Design an enzyme around this catalytic site. Structure first.
Site, PDB file in Angstrom:
ATOM      1  N   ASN A 153       5.474   6.152   2.680  1.00 15.28           N
ATOM      2  CA  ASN A 153       4.377   6.921   2.133  1.00 15.28           C
ATOM      3  C   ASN A 153       4.159   8.276   2.737  1.00 15.28           C
ATOM      4  O   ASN A 153       3.231   8.936   2.366  1.00 15.28           O
ATOM      5  CB  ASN A 153       3.083   6.126   2.253  1.00 15.28           C
ATOM      6  N   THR A 154       4.980   8.668   3.699  1.00 13.51           N
ATOM      7  CA  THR A 154       5.166  10.064   4.071  1.00 13.51           C
ATOM      8  C   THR A 154       6.652  10.370   4.159  1.00 13.51           C
ATOM      9  O   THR A 154       7.408   9.642   4.761  1.00 13.51           O
ATOM     10  CB  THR A 154       4.435  10.496   5.319  1.00 13.51           C
TER      11      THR A 154
ATOM     12  N   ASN B 282       5.537  -1.879  11.795  1.00 17.28           N
ATOM     13  CA  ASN B 282       4.810  -1.355  10.645  1.00 17.28           C
ATOM     14  C   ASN B 282       5.169  -2.142   9.376  1.00 17.28           C
ATOM     15  O   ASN B 282       5.787  -3.202   9.454  1.00 17.28           O
ATOM     16  CB  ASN B 282       5.091   0.144  10.479  1.00 17.28           C
TER      17      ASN B 282
ATOM     18  N   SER C  19       5.425   4.891   9.165  1.00 20.56           N
ATOM     19  CA  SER C  19       4.996   4.758   7.792  1.00 20.56           C
ATOM     20  C   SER C  19       5.915   5.177   6.686  1.00 20.56           C
ATOM     21  O   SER C  19       6.566   6.190   6.722  1.00 20.56           O
ATOM     22  CB  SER C  19       3.736   5.593   7.622  1.00 20.56           C
TER      23      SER C  19
ATOM     24  N   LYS D 137       4.885   3.170  17.304  1.00 17.90           N
ATOM     25  CA  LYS D 137       4.973   2.141  16.277  1.00 17.90           C
ATOM     26  C   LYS D 137       6.250   2.313  15.464  1.00 17.90           C
ATOM     27  O   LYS D 137       6.529   3.397  14.949  1.00 17.90           O
ATOM     28  CB  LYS D 137       3.738   2.160  15.371  1.00 17.90           C
TER      29      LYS D 137
ATOM     30  N   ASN E   2       0.805  -1.211   0.000  1.00 14.86           N
ATOM     31  CA  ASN E   2       0.000   0.000   0.000  1.00 14.86           C
ATOM     32  C   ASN E   2       0.839   1.262   0.000  1.00 14.86           C
ATOM     33  O   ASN E   2       1.987   1.266   0.449  1.00 14.86           O
ATOM     34  CB  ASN E   2      -0.951   0.029   1.204  1.00 14.86           C
TER      35      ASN E   2
ATOM     36  N   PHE F  72      -1.643   8.346   4.527  1.00 14.20           N
ATOM     37  CA  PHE F  72      -2.401   8.976   5.605  1.00 14.20           C
ATOM     38  C   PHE F  72      -3.674   9.688   5.160  1.00 14.20           C
ATOM     39  O   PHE F  72      -3.975  10.788   5.634  1.00 14.20           O
ATOM     40  CB  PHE F  72      -1.526   9.948   6.419  1.00 14.20           C
TER      41      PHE F  72
END
Ligand SMILES: Cc1cc2nc3c(=O)[nH]c(=O)nc-3n(C[C@H](O)[C@H](O)[C@H](O)COP(=O)(O)O)c2cc1C
Ligand SMILES: Cc1cc(Nc2ccc(C(F)(F)F)cc2)n2ncnc2n1
Ligand SMILES: O=C(O)c1cc(=O)[nH]c(=O)[nH]1
Length: 376
Positions: free
Chosen positions: A187-188, A268, A185, A239, A114, A118
């Site tokens: 994706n940031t 994660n 995460s 996390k 994915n 966010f």
């Protein structure tokens, strides 16, 4: 079991075959919202209780963050037989997230990639949702003692992370049993918002501080300030991403000990897997069975580096009672499932709890708390 579960798993396996992943997710979130999903009304085994500090879980299974990002569907997901849910990750300001499609499955390897980035309705709206859940909870017998944690994140636009957390805490802390800080995460930017021990250390301290302030600021007794399950202040979890070298890992352990963090969520999604042919042209972090061995290994390390001082929440790659026990013996107190739900459907919680109960008996353990960290 039930036909209800049977009918839905056929339905879900169909959706799995034909429909886009994010479209499926939303449809099932929507069914939940409307409360047409099946309930697990079974009593959980008292020998499978677990806890993190004075936070008590009726069973060792919950749904990980990213599943109900906006808290639209908490009652129904919990009533699938989970003891807890981690809503979010949320941001102070709602975001679209990255371009669709941004969720891709690989059935053969039971794995997901994915790059949601966010997406969420934002702190205020989600706080309104959680408030409404909490009111529903007071009159819903099946929801009592169920735990809702909240995962909190920086806005993609934003320069400074702390400010974003403080805001989230100020808005939603009153309604949370625990808060999950994630700096893990993909994706940031960039790629992983930093967990630089000095940075993290600064981050963790600010979070506890905000929470403390709420307690100070309010004139009410705790029974009316903490509109949550525990009636106490939200615990603080962090996390972690599994994409760190052994040194970065040791440095983080110190910080958690230094700040006396309530617990750590390990782990994660990872960007270090290439074996998935379907995923070769794809961007983001990988979930599912391929993460299982990596994340277990990561649980062991951090359990050692923190001297067993600090409680562990396990994620991900767990599909069976066996997978769960492997996480538990590595040093995990509770387990979180995301991928299993996509793969195995409505029945995952029911099945995994039975599977774990049987496995606990056949290994001669008296209760679950006896098996935590029993690989040492
Ligand atoms: C579609 C998708 C969205 C996710 N969103 C979040 C998120 O918002 N916040 C977070 O901390 N983790 C998020 N995750 C990571 C999961 O919470 C979980 O840690 C990971 O999937 C590993 O568990 P699993 O192997 O059972 O899937 C997401 C994962 C996926 C599959
Ligand atoms: C088929 C499918 C489903 C889905 N999620 C989903 C949602 C809710 C539930 C429920 F809670 F109902 F169990 C189970 C599964 N995703 N997500 C990404 N790809 C998906 N493909
Ligand atoms: O929102 C996302 O894209 C996301 C967040 C996160 O923490 N983990 C993940 O795999 N995706």
């Amino acid at each position: 079991y039930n036909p209800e579960f049977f009918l839905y798993d056929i339905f879900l396996k169909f959706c799995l075959k034909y429909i886009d992943g994010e479209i499926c997710h939303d449809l099932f979130l929507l069914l939940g919202k409307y409360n047409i999903l099946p309930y697990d009304t079974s009593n959980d085994s008292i020998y499978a209780c677990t806890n993190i500090k004075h936070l008590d879980f009726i069973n060792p299974f919950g749904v990980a963050a990213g599943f109900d990002k906006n808290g639209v569907c908490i009652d129904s997901i919990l009533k699938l037989g989970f003891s807890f849910i981690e809503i979010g990750t949320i941001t102070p300001r709602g975001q679209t997230g990255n371009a669709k499609p941004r969720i891709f499955r690989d059935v053969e390897s039971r794995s997901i990639i994915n790059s949601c980035g966010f997406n969420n309705m934002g702190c205020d709206k989600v706080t309104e949702n959680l408030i409404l859940f909490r009111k529903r909870q007071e009159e819903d017998k099946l929801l009592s003692k169920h735990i809702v944690g909240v995962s909190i994140g920086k806005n993609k636009d934003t320069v400074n992370i702390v400010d974003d957390l403080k805001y989230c805490i100020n808005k939603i802390g009153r309604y949370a049993d625990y808060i999950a800080i994630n700096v893990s995460s993909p994706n940031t930017p960039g790629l992983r918002d930093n967990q630089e021990a000095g940075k993290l250390k600064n981050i963790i301290l600010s979070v506890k501080e905000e929470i403390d302030n709420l307690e100070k600021n309010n004139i009410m007794n705790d029974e009316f300030l903490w509109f949550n399950t525990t009636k106490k202040k939200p615990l603080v979890f962090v996390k972690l991403a599994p994409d760190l070298n052994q040194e970065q890992k040791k440095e983080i352990a110190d910080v958690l000990l230094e700040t006396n963090i309530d617990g750590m969520i390990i782990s994660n999604t990872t960007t270090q897997i290439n074996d998935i042919k379907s995923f070769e042209n794809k961007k983001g972090g990988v979930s599912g069975a391929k993460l299982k061995d990596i994340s277990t290994k990561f649980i062991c390390e951090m359990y050692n580096y923190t001297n067993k001082q600090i409680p562990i929440i396990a994620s991900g790659g767990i599909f069976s009672g066996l997978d769960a026990l492997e996480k538990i013996e590595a040093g995990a107190s509770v387990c979180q499932l995301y991928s299993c739900l996509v793969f195995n459907g409505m029945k995952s919680a029911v099945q995994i709890k039975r599977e774990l109960n049987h496995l606990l008996y056949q290994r001669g353990y008296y209760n679950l708390k006896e098996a935590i960290g029993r690989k040492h």
